Amino acid sequence: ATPATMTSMVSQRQDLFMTDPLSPGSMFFLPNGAKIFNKLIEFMKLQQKFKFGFNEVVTPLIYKKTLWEKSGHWENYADDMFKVETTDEEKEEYGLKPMNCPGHCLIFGKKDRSYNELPLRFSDFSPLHRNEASGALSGLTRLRKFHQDDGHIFCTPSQVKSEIFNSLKLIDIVYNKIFPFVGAESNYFINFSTRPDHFIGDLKVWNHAEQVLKEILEESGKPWKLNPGDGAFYGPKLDIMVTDHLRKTHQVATIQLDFQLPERFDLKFKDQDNSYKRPIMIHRATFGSIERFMALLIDSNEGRWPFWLNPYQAVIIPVNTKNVQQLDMCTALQKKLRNELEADDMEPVPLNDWHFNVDLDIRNEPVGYRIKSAILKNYSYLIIVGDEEVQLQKYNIRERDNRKSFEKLTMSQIWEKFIELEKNYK
Amino acid sequence: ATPATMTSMVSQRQDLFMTDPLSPGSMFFLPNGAKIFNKLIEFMKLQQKFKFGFNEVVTPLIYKKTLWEKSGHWENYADDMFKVETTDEEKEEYGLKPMNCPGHCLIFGKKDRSYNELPLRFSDFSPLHRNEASGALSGLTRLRKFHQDDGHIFCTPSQVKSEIFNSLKLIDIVYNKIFPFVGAESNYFINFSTRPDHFIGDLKVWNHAEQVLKEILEESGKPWKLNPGDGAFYGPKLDIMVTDHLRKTHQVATIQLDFQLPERFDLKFKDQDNSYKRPIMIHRATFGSIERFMALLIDSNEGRWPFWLNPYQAVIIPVNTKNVQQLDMCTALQKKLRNELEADDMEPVPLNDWHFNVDLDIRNEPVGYRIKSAILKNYSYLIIVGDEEVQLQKYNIRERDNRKSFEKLTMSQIWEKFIELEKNYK
Ligand SMILES: [K+]
Ligand SMILES: [K+]
Ligand SMILES: [K+]
Ligand SMILES: [K+]
Ligand SMILES: [K+]
Ligand SMILES: [K+]
Ligand SMILES: [K+]
Ligand SMILES: [K+]
Ligand SMILES: [Zn+2]
Ligand SMILES: [Zn+2]
Numbered sequence: 028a029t030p031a032t033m034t035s036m037v038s039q040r041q042d043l044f045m046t047d048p049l050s051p052g053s054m055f056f057l058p059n060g061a062k063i064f065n066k067l068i069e070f071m072k073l074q075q076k077f078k079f080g081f082n083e084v085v086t087p088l089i090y091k092k093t094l095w096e097k098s099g100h101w102e103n104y105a106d107d108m109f110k111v112e113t114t115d116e117e118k119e120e121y122g123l124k125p126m127n128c129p130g131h132c133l134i135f136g137k138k139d140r141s142y143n144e145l146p147l148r149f150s151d152f153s154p155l156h157r158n159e160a161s162g163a164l165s166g167l168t169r170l171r172k173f174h175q176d177d178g179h180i181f182c183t184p185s186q187v188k189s190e191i192f193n194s195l196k197l198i199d200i201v202y203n204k205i206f207p208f209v210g211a212e213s214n215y216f217i218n219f220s221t222r223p224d225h226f227i228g229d230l231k232v233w234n235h236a237e238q239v240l241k242e243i244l245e246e247s248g249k250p251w252k253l254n255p256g257d258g259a260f261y262g263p264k265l266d267i268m269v270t271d272h273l274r275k276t277h278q279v280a281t282i283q284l285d286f287q288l289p290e291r292f293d294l295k296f297k298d299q300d301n302s303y304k305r306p307i308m309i310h311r312a313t314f315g316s317i318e319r320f321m322a323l324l325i326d327s328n329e330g331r332w333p334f335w336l337n338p339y340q341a342v343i344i345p346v347n348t349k350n351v352q353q354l355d356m357c358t359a360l361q362k363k364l365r366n367e368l369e370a371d372d373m374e375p376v377p378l379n380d381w382h383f384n385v386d387l388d389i390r391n392e393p394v395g396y397r398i399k400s401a402i403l404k405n406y407s408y409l410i411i412v413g414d415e416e417v418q419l420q421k422y423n424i425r426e427r428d429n430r431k432s433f434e435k436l437t438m439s440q441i442w443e444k445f446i447e448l449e450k451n452y453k
Numbered sequence: 454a455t456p457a458t459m460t461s462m463v464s465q466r467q468d469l470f471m472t473d474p475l476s477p478g479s480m481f482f483l484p485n486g487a488k489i490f491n492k493l494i495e496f497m498k499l500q501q502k503f504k505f506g507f508n509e510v511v512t513p514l515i516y517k518k519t520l521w522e523k524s525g526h527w528e529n530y531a532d533d534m535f536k537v538e539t540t541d542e543e544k545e546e547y548g549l550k551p552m553n554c555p556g557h558c559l560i561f562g563k564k565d566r567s568y569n570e571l572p573l574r575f576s577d578f579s580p581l582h583r584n585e586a587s588g589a590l591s592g593l594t595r596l597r598k599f600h601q602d603d604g605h606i607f608c609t610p611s612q613v614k615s616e617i618f619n620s621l622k623l624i625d626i627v628y629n630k631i632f633p634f635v636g637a638e639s640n641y642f643i644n645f646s647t648r649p650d651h652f653i654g655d656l657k658v659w660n661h662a663e664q665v666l667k668e669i670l671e672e673s674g675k676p677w678k679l680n681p682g683d684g685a686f687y688g689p690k691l692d693i694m695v696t697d698h699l700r701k702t703h704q705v706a707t708i709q710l711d712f713q714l715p716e717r718f719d720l721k722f723k724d725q726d727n728s729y730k731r732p733i734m735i736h737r738a739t740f741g742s743i744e745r746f747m748a749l750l751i752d753s754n755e756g757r758w759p760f761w762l763n764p765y766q767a768v769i770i771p772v773n774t775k776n777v778q779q780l781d782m783c784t785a786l787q788k789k790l791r792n793e794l795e796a797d798d799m800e801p802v803p804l805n806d807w808h809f810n811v812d813l814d815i816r817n818e819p820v821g822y823r824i825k826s827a828i829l830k831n832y833s834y835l836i837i838v839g840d841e842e843v844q845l846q847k848y849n850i851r852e853r854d855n856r857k858s859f860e861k862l863t864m865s866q867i868w869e870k871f872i873e874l875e876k877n878y879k
Contacts, residue, residue: 050517055512057560058509073804077806083484087476087480088582110539112540134481137483196799366503368504369504376500
């Protein structure tokens with residue numbers, strides 16, 4: 028079985044995604060797929076805004092050909108770029124953005140910048156488009172449209188290493204802490220991607236940029252490999268490489284050292300001596316393609332999501348669907364955990380309340396088969412209620428991946444237990 | 454002063470937005486603008502997911518000309534549609550989506566549908582594109598690109614009125630509860646937008662759809678006006694009209710009754726008799742253009758945001774910036790309220806923690822001028838610390854819009870006070 032196949036099998040079983048040839052290379056996120064998608068974005072936004080000092084911006088999707096010419100993307104990134112011309116009488120040429128670099132340069136240039144605000148970090152969770160061949164499309168790994176935690180840092184020379192080390196820290200949080208993956212201790216190795224045949228700028232600067240990067244690479248102690256000619260046209264980069272269960276490698280994140288784009292946009296800040304100076308840019312993405320990241324999570328978990336990510340967090344199963352006592356206790360729990368409001372009052376859903384994806388299977392089917400269905404769907408928890416549970420007023424709850432043991436918990440305890448799980452990414 | 458002018462003045466004062474001719478009609482959301490933008494989206498997602506029974510989906514941005522022909526948007530919505538052709542050798546024609554109707558029909562058709570799951574509600578917070586004239590662009594009210602809480606409901610005949618009444622309920626929550634606006638008691642009136650000159654489908658169905666809508670209109674008790682010929686090509690609609698301070702009207706939300714698109718996509722569900730039947734579609738948007746909504750909030754508040762929306766929630770001002778005691782107490786508060794984590798540990802920012810936009814003005818300027826600056830920026834709270842505050846270990850805190858009174862509060866009390874404000878949209 029291939030990863031694309033595993034992704035597809037899980038998607039069909041959990042109703043995650045769908046595709047349509049009227050929009051080739053672009054995913055549809057069904058409700059369950061969107062829940063996972065949004066969960067990942069929410070998590071990443073938090074780390075970037077409240078831990079790594081990033082400020083999110085929201086940018087246009089299409090830009091006139093001119094901007095791409097000014098950045099150097101139009102030529103030096105021509106084949107990957109999704110180019111269009113409008114079909115109105117005055118056919119203007121456009122590029123759907125394949126990345127946010129130029130737009131973020133416009134933003135940097137919009138206000139007078141001072142050394143006071145460096146490093147200046149912008150994050151952007153926008154749809155990117157890249158027009159690659161039909162025969163190159165594969166599941167969620169290769170798409171024409173995908174989302175990315177695009178990000179750009181504007182800093183001074185003495186800030187470069189610190190900024191890249193903090194970049195690596197976030198990368199490690201994602202790939203070596205929060206998520207489980209199945210050679211070395213780390214779930215990735217670094218590709219040292221060097222000057223491409225077609226590069227913009229001066230060779231001695233390029234040499235300098237590659238020297239700085241390699242020094243950081245060495246100081247990090249992280250395993251790395253030389254990756255000749257795969258740098259961006261504007262600078263060399265550290266590409267984070269994750270390995271398939273079929274031992275195929277994928278770039279999932281990147282850190283790019285860019286001394287060139289600032290030149291092309293005439294970027295400048297007022298230094299600690301009132302002189303003007305070019306900021307250095309660090310391009311960065313931790314998820315890279317969020318779609319690709321999800322595909323790789325699935326390659327490892329085979330649909331067995333962590334509780335906090337799971338669109339199927341818990342199912343509640345009454346032994347006898349005709350029993351009012353069992354039903355009441357089940358319904359009571361579902362309402363508590365879902366924490367929803369009625370559409371009949373003017374009372375709004377408050378910010379930062381907890382809401383859990385828990386379902387209630389009262390289908391007229393044998394209890395054993397309702398349980399088997401829940402198992403196939405990879406519910407993180409199975410919550411069963413029989414006469415004894417009603418009597419004790421405690422729920423029988425067991426975790427999907429624990430085979431024999433189980434807990435008997437009150438409604439309040441389950442509530443707090445789930446809060447604990449999700450709050451801290453279990 | 455015009456609304457566009459007021460929006461621009463506030464934007465410049467608070468660094469909310471920016472524009473660039475390389476992307477005409479599309480906004481850039483600076484960090485402060487994005488905070489407000491994201492806050493609004495977060496609020497709306499909550500109401501829709503946990504109160505009004507909606508499931509969010511994520512869809513492609515571009516679709517082949519064919520889909521638009523199948524829906525009827527290509528012709529019957531030609532002038533508003535943003536049409537393109539790719540500039541590769543094989544020039545394929547595309548439409549950036551001006552709305553999600555067709556995509557949501559593809560989704561409905563992807564799985565076998567049963568009466569069990571009706572009404573079936575999909576919400577979609579995507580960028581929409583509409584290609585309208587340069588001389589039609591105005592601030593945030595008329596744009597080529599904008600975001601919308603697009604949404605579509607698939608229901609049965611007997612569910613139409615209930616669904617539309619709940620739609621109206623959400624609309625009232627936004628426009629007649631949560632936000633303040635400055636003729637009738639309600640901050641809007643309804644336009645009964647009837648069959649357009651160019652409509653798809655059968656006239657008797659159209660007559661029926663308009664009859665149902667009018668009946669709902671009458672039962673609602675809400676003031677409304679006849680709006681001839683302004684219905685969609687697929688159905689009549691209730692357009693929510695909000696009034697400027699310059700007495701100009703704007704559509705900010707919509708509810709559209711659609712018996713036609715289901716026909717064109719051959720949509721069907723299995724009824725309570727195992728027969729197949731066309732679902733009815735209700736198109737809906739509460740914010741409409743989120744950009745337009747923000748412009749109208751500004752038309753009323755003139756930059757004086759509610760605490761929960763404010764990018765400038767509170768500023769902390771030490772009387773003497775050279776005083777360690779004052780500084781410590783100020784810094785202690787800022788750290789508490791911001792609730793950030795260090796980039797030096799592997800400890801992740803947990804879900805659903807509180808984080809407040811509070812700044813610390815220790816600029817070497819007279820205290821009176823630092824205060825004046827905060828006032829101009831419309832900080833919701835001014836928090837001042839002098840010797841007496843250090844002595845008492847309580848902060849002097851006053852609300853922007855309260856002229857004389859103030860509170861003396863501990864760090865913990867301020868924390869909980871802000872939680873209360875934001876949690877419940879003050
Ligand atoms: K320096
Ligand atoms: K990039
Ligand atoms: K049984
Ligand atoms: K036990
Ligand atoms: K019916
Ligand atoms: K619409
Ligand atoms: K003074
Ligand atoms: K007091
Ligand atoms: Zn970049
Ligand atoms: Zn629609």
